[PDB]
């Protein structure tokens, strides 16, 4: 019954642009942050580890310093959105979205990057 979903399971983006990939999860009325965990991963790197209302930057891979953000206001709407700025060719590959809010689930997303 608790299910993480993906509007798009595939993204195709231009080199150098911005991108926001989305994982959705069910929220009824108001969202309690204490109960909520969000992970975004890419390959063996950690992009986002959101626990206790806070992103944990000491666990974050340094490749992603300055360019990666979980969009906080989108969370109330049951949408774990990951904004990555200045997209490079190395950003291409399979991403993972884990969300725990009572129950827990995860999904994968593929990002493809065209060069010019």
């Amino acid at each position, epitope marked *: 019954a608790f*299910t993480v979903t*993906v509007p798009k*399971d*595939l993204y195709v983006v231009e080199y150098g642009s911005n991108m926001t990939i989305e994982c959705k999860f069910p929220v009824e009325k108001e969202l309690d942050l204490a109960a909520l965990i969000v992970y975004w*991963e890419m*390959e*063996d790197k950690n992009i986002i580890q959101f626990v206790h209302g806070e992103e944990d930057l000491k666990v974050q891979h340094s490749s992603y310093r300055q360019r990666a953000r979980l969009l906080k206001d989108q969370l109330s709407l049951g949408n774990a959105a990951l904004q990555i700025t200045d997209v490079k060719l190395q950003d291409a590959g*399979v991403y*993972r979205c*884990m969300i725990s809010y009572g129950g*827990a*689930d*995860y*999904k*994968r*997303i*593929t990002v493809k990057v065209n060069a010019p």
Partner: antibody
Amino acid sequence: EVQLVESGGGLVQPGGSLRLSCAASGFTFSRYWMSWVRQAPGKGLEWVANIKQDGSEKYYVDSVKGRFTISRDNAKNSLYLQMNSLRAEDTAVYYCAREGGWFGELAFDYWGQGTLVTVSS
Amino acid sequence: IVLTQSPGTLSLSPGERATLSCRASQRVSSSYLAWYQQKPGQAPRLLIYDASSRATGIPDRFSGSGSGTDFTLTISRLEPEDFAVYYCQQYGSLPWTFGQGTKVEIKR
């Protein structure tokens, strides 16, 4: 030369407990998601449990949730299934499988040969 | 997510082409659909992943296609070694699930 070897199976009476183990070789075990899959005699294949590289996340089928516990030791190159409160429908060959790629996107890459678990009075 | 394989049994001569169906009750995310081969007394071998890619060392008479909820596995020009039970499996969405299998039997 990826290798997978299960151990620990046998006979156990209903309501009893048993611990399966799986040894890995030929690949970096700490880099991969690992699964258990079972098969009852004459039936088809059923996925059972899942564990993340660091043991930080675990998922189960409905039928074993609350009864089976999956766990792993990356140092020992080994995977474990602690089965408790066993019913007769848990009787099956139990396989360990590597989930290939980073997050399992290469499906079940490689399998052990399986070990038979028999649950009966 | 329920996978319904079809048909139950195929009776074919070596050299014939085999077509196996897998239908899903839901869309399979990213087309993460695997196929497997099992011979009696052995563990399954991976054939196809991501619906259309061959696993390593799998010969090219094994070919996958489909997308969404409808998936096909084709074995063109069957060899004697290809007669076995075939399984499809979805790994796009938890819980991972398997179809009930298809047996490809030598017709003599």
